[PDB]
Write a protein that binds this ligand. Structure first.
Ligand SMILES: Nc1nc2c(ncn2[C@@H]2O[C@H](COP(=O)(O)OP(=O)(O)NP(=O)(O)O)[C@@H](O)[C@H]2O)c(=O)[nH]1
Ligand SMILES: [Mg+2]
Length: 166
């Protein structure tokens, strides 16, 4: 079994916890809406390889977290999440990417740009705009809904594949 340390980042309210919980849930607990940053585990077979995913659901930059720097040092890949109905969350992506680059001292960190809440009609960030940004970073872009589950597994598995291909 190969272990991957994945970190989910992005602005307050974009759906970092909803995404993490949707991936990792065993559904014994009906509703789980975490209020605090935390770490979760999921075992999954990705392309024949049994993987243990350790997933850190971080708070947005506007919340204080003592361990944030060490989180980024430990993290092997990062899901950079914004919400497709929240332009500010999209503009904020630059800040998360600069923080990771500053801490890890690298331009080549495995990452996936995630445009969450794609179930919503009230879109303010066009897919093409986010594809352009992802292209500028040299990373994949994947739209998700934590409500419908669309794209959720693909986002996390794409990140694993980026780590593996690094
Ligand atoms: N329509 C829709 N709502 C979503 C989606 N993902 C999350 N939400 C909703 O958006 C809100 C924020 O979700 P949450 O998972 O707490 O986001 P967060 O990024 O972890 N927030 P925080 O930074 O404060 O921990 C909740 O009301 C949640 O139900 C999605 O894909 N679609
Ligand atoms: Mg959260």
């Amino acid at each position: 079994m190969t272990e991957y340390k994945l970190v989910v980042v992005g602005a307050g309210g974009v759906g970092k916890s909803a995404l993490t919980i949707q991936l990792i849930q065993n559904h014994f607990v009906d509703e789980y809406d975490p209020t605090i940053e935390d770490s979760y585990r999921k075992q999954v077979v990705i392309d024949g390889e049994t993987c243990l995913l350790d997933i850190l659901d971080t708070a947005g930059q506007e919340e204080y977290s003592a361990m944030r720097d060490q989180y980024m040092r430990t993290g092997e890949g990062f899901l950079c999440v914004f919400a497709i109905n929240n332009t500010k969350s999209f503009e904020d992506i630059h800040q998360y990417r600069e923080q990771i680059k500053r801490v890890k001292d690298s331009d080549d960190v495995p990452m996936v740009l995630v445009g969450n809440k794609c179930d919503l009609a009230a879109r303010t960030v066009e897919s093409r705009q986010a594809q352009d940004l992802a292209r500028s970073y040299g990373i994949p872009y994947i739209e998700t809904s934590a409500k419908t589950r669309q794209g959720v597994e693909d986002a996390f598995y794409t990140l694993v594949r980026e780590i593996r291909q690094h």
